[PDB]
């Protein structure tokens, strides 16, 4: 025939019909719920911020974003975790900026 199943190539593999199904409930782990988000927001305004988080906000306030990321990565430890933390710290700065605007 023109084309055959192959053990190599971009479309390699034995051909089976894929069984589509709902993902397992363990794969749901880590999703943020409405109540858990509410609790974490409660604790954040009760507690505040860690001293390194406040320092990183000063760097973001003067728009030293590369230096802020270097500082956060040195504190938290990894690039992926630092990028997520920097976005959140940028978000709270923007949130309190528009709160003080009105």
């Amino acid at each position: 025939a023109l084309r055959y199943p192959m053990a190599v190539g971009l479309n390699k593999g034995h051909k089976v019909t894929k069984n589509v199904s709902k993902p397992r409930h363990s794969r749901r782990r880590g999703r943020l719920t409405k109540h858990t988000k509410f609790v974490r927001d409660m604790i954040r305004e009760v507690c505040g911020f860690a001293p390194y988080e406040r320092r990183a906000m000063e760097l973001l306030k003067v728009s030293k974003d590369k230096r802020a990321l270097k500082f956060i990565k040195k504190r938290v430890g990894t690039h992926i975790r630092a990028k997520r933390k920097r976005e959140e710290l940028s978000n709270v700065l923007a949130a309190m900026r528009k709160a003080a605007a009105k």
Binding site: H35, F38, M42, I43, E45, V46, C47
Partner: protein
């Protein structure tokens, strides 16, 4: 330097107000073991002859316990929350003033977890919450 989350529990109710609050709260104490037995036996006697189920309007009662009160505040079901000022592991109630204010339920801080315990026939209670109240005490609860 005590952070305001911990310093807020030093502001307790004055003696006059705490007296009106506990005097009202005396009318809604949870039923003891003895009078629950008396009530349950009466239900058994009445069910035997001859009314039947007879819910008979489960009366308003003072809800107690930090886990119970927290859910009531989160559901906006509490009308008034009373927090003891001397919870020794002070993490059980540090969020409650902020949580109550966020949910709009009025809250006060009172002197003595032992006084709250006597309300519920126990040694100690962190918090008690006022749910719906009898009509003759709606005026009193509103003033508080």
């Amino acid at each position: 330097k005590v952070p305001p989350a911990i310093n807020q529990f030093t502001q307790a109710l004055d003696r006059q107000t705490a007296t009106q609050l506990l005097k009202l709260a005396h009318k809604y104490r949870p039923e003891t073991k003895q009078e629950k037995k008396q009530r349950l036996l009466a239900r058994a006697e009445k069910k035997a002859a001859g009314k039947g189920d007879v819910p008979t309007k489960r009366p308003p009662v003072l809800r107690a316990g930090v886990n119970t009160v927290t859910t009531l505040v989160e559901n906006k079901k509490a009308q008034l929350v009373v927090i003891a000022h001397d919870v020794d592991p002070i993490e059980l109630v540090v969020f409650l003033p902020a949580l109550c204010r966020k949910m709009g339920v009025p809250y006060c801080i009172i002197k003595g977890k032992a006084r709250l315990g006597r309300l519920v026939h126990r040694k100690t209670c962190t918090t008690v919450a006022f749910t719906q109240v009898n009509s003759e005490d709606k005026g009193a609860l509103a003033k508080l």
